[PDB]
Design a protein around this motif. Structure first.
Motif, PDB file in Angstrom:
ATOM      1  N   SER C  54     -73.038  15.878 -23.941  1.00 55.33           N
ATOM      2  CA  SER C  54     -72.089  15.648 -22.866  1.00 55.33           C
ATOM      3  C   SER C  54     -71.302  14.387 -23.184  1.00 55.33           C
ATOM      4  O   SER C  54     -71.855  13.420 -23.719  1.00 55.33           O
ATOM      5  N   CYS C  55     -70.009  14.411 -22.874  1.00 54.77           N
ATOM      6  CA  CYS C  55     -69.091  13.350 -23.260  1.00 54.77           C
ATOM      7  C   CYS C  55     -68.261  12.907 -22.065  1.00 54.77           C
ATOM      8  O   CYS C  55     -68.121  13.644 -21.085  1.00 54.77           O
ATOM      9  N   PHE C  56     -67.709  11.697 -22.163  1.00 56.26           N
ATOM     10  CA  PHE C  56     -66.808  11.133 -21.156  1.00 56.26           C
ATOM     11  C   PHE C  56     -65.380  11.157 -21.699  1.00 56.26           C
ATOM     12  O   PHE C  56     -64.951  10.279 -22.446  1.00 56.26           O
ATOM     13  N   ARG C 248     -73.264  11.481 -24.721  1.00 56.69           N
ATOM     14  CA  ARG C 248     -74.615  11.422 -24.181  1.00 56.69           C
ATOM     15  C   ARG C 248     -75.320  12.753 -24.396  1.00 56.69           C
ATOM     16  O   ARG C 248     -74.796  13.808 -24.022  1.00 56.69           O
TER      17      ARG C 248
ATOM     18  N   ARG E  64     -64.440  16.799 -16.661  1.00 55.37           N
ATOM     19  CA  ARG E  64     -65.698  16.461 -17.319  1.00 55.37           C
ATOM     20  C   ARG E  64     -65.996  14.967 -17.329  1.00 55.37           C
ATOM     21  O   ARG E  64     -67.083  14.566 -17.756  1.00 55.37           O
ATOM     22  N   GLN E  65     -65.134  14.147 -16.726  1.00 56.15           N
ATOM     23  CA  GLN E  65     -65.643  12.885 -16.200  1.00 56.15           C
ATOM     24  C   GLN E  65     -66.744  13.147 -15.178  1.00 56.15           C
ATOM     25  O   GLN E  65     -67.848  12.590 -15.274  1.00 56.15           O
ATOM     26  N   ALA E  67     -68.269  15.994 -14.914  1.00 56.09           N
ATOM     27  CA  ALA E  67     -69.334  16.724 -15.602  1.00 56.09           C
ATOM     28  C   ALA E  67     -70.334  15.769 -16.249  1.00 56.09           C
ATOM     29  O   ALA E  67     -71.548  15.994 -16.179  1.00 56.09           O
ATOM     30  N   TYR E  68     -69.844  14.704 -16.891  1.00 54.10           N
ATOM     31  CA  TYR E  68     -70.728  13.640 -17.361  1.00 54.10           C
ATOM     32  C   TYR E  68     -71.497  13.019 -16.201  1.00 54.10           C
ATOM     33  O   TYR E  68     -72.704  12.768 -16.312  1.00 54.10           O
ATOM     34  N   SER E  71     -74.258  15.510 -15.357  1.00 53.91           N
ATOM     35  CA  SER E  71     -75.196  15.830 -16.424  1.00 53.91           C
ATOM     36  C   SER E  71     -75.987  14.624 -16.912  1.00 53.91           C
ATOM     37  O   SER E  71     -77.028  14.801 -17.556  1.00 53.91           O
ATOM     38  N   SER E  72     -75.529  13.407 -16.627  1.00 57.02           N
ATOM     39  CA  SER E  72     -76.224  12.210 -17.079  1.00 57.02           C
ATOM     40  C   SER E  72     -77.224  11.678 -16.062  1.00 57.02           C
ATOM     41  O   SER E  72     -77.831  10.629 -16.303  1.00 57.02           O
TER      42      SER E  72
END
Lengths: 358, 358, 358, 358, 358
Positions: C54-56, C248, E64-65, E67-68, E71-72
């Motif tokens: 997973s990425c930012f 991450r 996906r900001q 989404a991170y 998921s984090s």
């Protein structure tokens, strides 16, 4: 998938008889399964297709404006080239698997004719022949115990010929049903027609496949892009692109590989059936030397005259494949020693005591 | 998946005979299943692929402008490097599973030839030999009750040799069909061709696989990025990026691991088939000492002369694997005691009363 | 899932013989199934993974700009730390299940060698021994009806020893094949090699697993974040983030738990195989006292001398597990009463009438 | 899919009797499976449909404004042409598979009538006839051992006719139940009605299919676009497009191909059933020459008079297909030699000793 | 799902013997299947989970900001409460099914020990006892035909006791192997250890489960919300929310219901195993009155002395469950009439003629 059902009924695996030649089995297997294999490979597993046609919509278009863009071109594959207005259509691209499955179902017709129009009569004939031949054996085994004591105490020729000539003028020696039946069938000419049509049908099918790949293919082979039009109707009263350009097809590589595979397999397959045709143009006499000495097999080699296109030739060819099942697989096959005589009399003096079997 | 159907027909699990060697079975299993295992691992389950090609579209592009971007490059894998204009193509990346399945179907051809061109004749021959050998036993069991009372009341040698020499000049002692059949087959040289071709075909297949991995692979192995072009045609009259850069492929790791696995398994597999070839270059005489005393087995060890490339060698090798089924698995296998004589006469005096079995 | 097929063929459930030790069965089960259990638990059911990386992405990025972000890092796991330019790679994270399945397939090799290189000879030997031993019984049962009337009307010693000494000098008393066969095998030293290699192979496999978990693991164990770069190539001529930070990984907990489970199970498994090795370093004489009185079993306890590494030791160990099947499970097992004599003569006077069984 | 269940019960594969003609089987198979094949091809696998109707929504519309657009037209297929206000409806497009499955279930009705209204009586009749005929054989086999010694020592005619004429006035010669039963059935006229209705029903079904394809099809065949209206009700008090234009259907090609396939298969199928009808308009006398000499078969050829529409004709046609099962497949089929006499007396002198069979 | 495989091998459904008690079977079934049932219910079918952790991202965040964001936190369950900086972790929430499956696999260990360490010896012992007892019957049936005519013509006592006392001093009356074997086993004390350990192991397992639910549970039971932090590392040099608040877990209800179900089932299960333990603390003498009259069963009731912890008690308890299989299910079970004598002599005078059975 319907392929599972097709394999379940088509090509899925009397009472011992072999009715189909191994080379015929091989050519049937390759010609029937190869279209199915290309079917399974082209559309499933390997290349997850999604949308086989892809388009470049303008940026202002919303979600299903562009969805209409992408969905109204796959069913309307037409290249509105600027060169008047020759709409070149792209129906082979959407017709590849349809033609593949049609060819697959077409390949099985000769099998249908060969299995319905000739199998029952041939099977009945072979059932009669096997019944008469195992009767011919069990009416001849009775000679090996009459020749265990009288065969010993005499001076060779006048008991190896005196009883043999007495057996010569004896009923067990001759097989009258054999010559009469063989005549009544060798004069017939019905079974060769089924063979010739079963080969010629697949030959003309291969020719039709060649024509199909020559006319409808080989023209759109390096073209991966074409321009369509959305206002080919009532869309004209709208403010958008007058010509929807660059409808790119994604399966050009699959198109090329399936075309080349199909043409190559049929080029490599053609000569085999020609060889099968030429197999019937000559009389087989490889082992005729040993057939002329045996009582029953003398008649088989005696009727070798005239033009070889007869039902007797087909019967003999199918019999040579069945001549080694369980009982005809005997001294016959063992008789590989007389292919290079009073000495053989004492050799077979011992052999008749060697063929006691049970 | 078609893999299910392939496993259902290909590699899915007479009347007791063993026709295939265990080492041949092992090499067949590894050479046939390993491409299928790599097939299942590479594309399914483990790595949920989605789009194996990924691209960097400009920010101004809308949804299916970039969808055309991503979909028009997977089928047009070509690196328009600045170095004139050498379009390096990336067809191995999309051809990996195609070549894998072609290799998988190619590996099974030697099995086809070995199972169609040699199995029926060998099976018939072994059926004849087993019939004659169990007849040889039930015509020899009758000696263990003739030797239960006459065997007792005499002074050893003149009943252990007087009856044995009388049995020596008696019909049950010799097996005439055995020597004649063994001669008629040992002079033949047809079955060894099938073995040598079945090995050489897989050898040349492995060589072709090595050439394929040496030429088309090992060149694009560390390259994960290439630049394509969208105006390679009628796109030229548009205002966008002149060169669509950085089409990144996602399956480079899978590419590398499958290549290394394929090369490693074949490097470790090559010597086994070479050993199989060398198995036929020598006459096996490990237990020839015990074979020369038995009546029927004396002929087997007697014909050990000349060059070992004969059908007799293959027949013997396939017989040693079948020499312990249910009846040949007897005193034969028990006879591990004479590998280190008038004392043995009284030892076998008791043993003949010990082999009564039923 | 391929796990279903693997369980279908691998680990899925002569003619009565026990060829494998229960402790060997237990260690095989744990060493073979545990990697498969971790395989099933780590990736399926429990933790619905989705995207293990997973990425930012920056806010300005569109849909598949960020999709390229997320998809170009899982295959390119490299930490571009600022500390020159040491790209630390994260290949263990994507190689966990690959190493797991490789270890699972590696664990089964000793089973392969033990089942192919030693099973047939041992099975044949035990088949011979069971045949001779049930013959030894049915040639000894005939003594219980000769001793039903003559055994009664005499004054004990001179019929409990007069017939016994007459039976002592009688053929049924001794078992000559037993001592000769046992000698011919106890002098052999081939089967112990298979045992020692089958244990040492799994030992070195466990050592290799320890090395793998010590070098490639234990380094990235508390790191859940790393910074990648997108312009590691032709992306450099673009206006975006120069360094794509904070990729991450989501499966760090699964990583840790599978590593600890693997190391713990092998730490608890190691001593068992060492015990199995030490089982062969001594001669077992727990019940040698009762074996020295029985006629046939006297020879088994007689050959207890010298260094214990012999095939006789292995044969005895596998026989003690098979000494209680259906017939050897008799007075032998009942003889738990002589582990603490003219009185026993009248005790066995009644016992011989008690062992009539059918 | 329900197709699996339909194939499971419908068309899924006494005690030896053949009750249905092979040509009837072929026409049933093609007429029953072809609608199912078109069903499977049109909607599943090949053409992943999604939404068979596609529309051009205005750009201002949000997500499910346009979703209402697309979903309110498939169920309301009506062309509001400007030419007053003739709403042409497009119900054939959504009714294609409904009509296909209705036709498929309709095709099986003649099979139902033929299998329920005629099978039990015909099966009982054939069971009676086979019982009486194998009794007729085992009451006639007793003549081949009365003619093994008395048949030899006499001067031909006065034992080939003296016993034959004595057998002529003997009970075993005649078969009274045969003529009485054959009369009682040949005067009946009930079974021919089932045959004629079973053919005429499928004929009128084909005519109805032709009418359906002529009226409801062939009109919307080149039309792929139509304009609908959303304010055909309470939508009128809204500010949007007054007329929702260009509802494009995606399955026009499938429509055309299924229509052409259906019409072509029925055009090629029609003549076969006409031939089946004409099969009953004539008396079959191909082999009547050999039937007039046999005792029992003389009555079969004797009752050949008048108009051929009788139950006797149907019984004979179904008997000729069953005249070669296992016992009637005898000299009867062998008698292909008398289709081109005191010599035949000595030919059958030997043949009666040749038909000993068991 | 792996649950299918587990049910396939674990808990999936000599030669007639009952080796396990019904109450033991019930407690095993409930203790083994209940964790599996909670496993299947918690994660599959009922509650389609999706993402078990849900978060409130700020509105400015893109796809996906957030989404991170989502998921984090599932892998980093830590409550950064303001109360210094006690990060309370939420590992029970992600460890529920792991602990469930560990408990499920742990529950089966006592079954493993009871089935491997005690089953073979007990099965062999019962096989010996059944062999000797059916021999005891067929050596006693011979008394019912000696008592069909001599039993009739005498004045009752002097033939009901004269023959009985003669049979009393006769060999068939006593069963010497019975008393000797029963002594040799009743003095043994090995089998009771397996029983006590098999119960105590599950008892301590239940205690450990109670401790696990008391320490790691019952603390996070009403907490459904916690605040995490994203800049717990290199995120600190970014402009966003300093603390990511309100990570809400969705499966709190499932957490509570599974905890209560687990604790309740074990509270209701505990007393049963305590009862099983107390079953061995007393000598069972419910039907000892009828056992003291039968010859063989007198010895069973005779050895009732001292402390009841003996292998004889376990043997008797397992025998009472097997005392009604097919032959011991006889007059024994019928003898429910002597639980409330010269009259019984004439009652059994008729009964001995009533127990003729075959």
């Amino acid at each position: 998938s319907l392929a599972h059902t097709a394999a379940e009924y088509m090509l899925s695996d009397l009472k011992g008889l072999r009715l189909e030649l191994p080379l015929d089995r091989i050519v049937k297997f390759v010609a029937v399964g190869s279209p199915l294999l290309l079917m399974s490979l082209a559309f499933a597993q390997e290349f997850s297709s999604g949308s086989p046609i892809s388009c470049f919509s303008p940026s202002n278009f919303s979600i299903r404006q562009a969805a209409y863009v992408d969905s109204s071109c796959w069913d309307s594959l037409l290249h509105h080239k600027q060169d008047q207005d020759k709409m070149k259509s792209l129906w082979p691209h959407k017709a590849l698997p349809y033609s593949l499955l049609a060819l697959a179902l077409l390949m099985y017709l000769p099998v249908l004719l060969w299995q319905y129009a000739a199998v029952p009569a041939l099977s009945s004939d072979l059932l009669f022949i096997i019944s008469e031949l195992d009767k011919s054996y069990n009416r001849s085994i009775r000679l090996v115990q009459h020749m265990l004591k009288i065969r010993q105490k005499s001076s060779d020729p006048y008991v190896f010929w005196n009883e043999l000539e007495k057996a010569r003028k004896e009923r067990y020696f001759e097989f009258p049903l054999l010559e009469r039946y063989l005549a009544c069938k060798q004069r017939s000419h019905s079974l060769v027609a089924t063979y010739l049509l079963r080969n010629s049908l697949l030959l003309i099918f291969t020719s039709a496949t060649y024509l199909y790949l020559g006319h409808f293919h080989l023209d759109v082979f390096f073209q991966e892009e074409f321009s369509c039009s959305i206002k080919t109707g009532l869309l004209s009263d709208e403010t958008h692109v007058p010509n929807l350009i660059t409808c790119r097809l994604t399966s050009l590589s699959i198109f090329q590989i399936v075309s080349l595979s199909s043409v190559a397999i049929y080029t490599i397959l053609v000569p085999v059936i020609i060889y099968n045709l030429t197999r019937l143009c000559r009389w087989d006499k490889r082992l005729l030397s040993v057939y002329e000495m045996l009582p029953a097999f003398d008649l088989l080699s005696r009727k070798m005259l005239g033009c070889p296109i007869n039902d007797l030739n087909v019967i003999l060819l199918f019999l040579r494949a069945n001549i080694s099942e369980l009982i005809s697989f005997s001294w016959l096959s063992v008789l590989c020693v007389l292919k290079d005589h009073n000495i053989d009399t004492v050799v077979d003096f011992m052999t008749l005591l060697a063929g006691l079997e049970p």
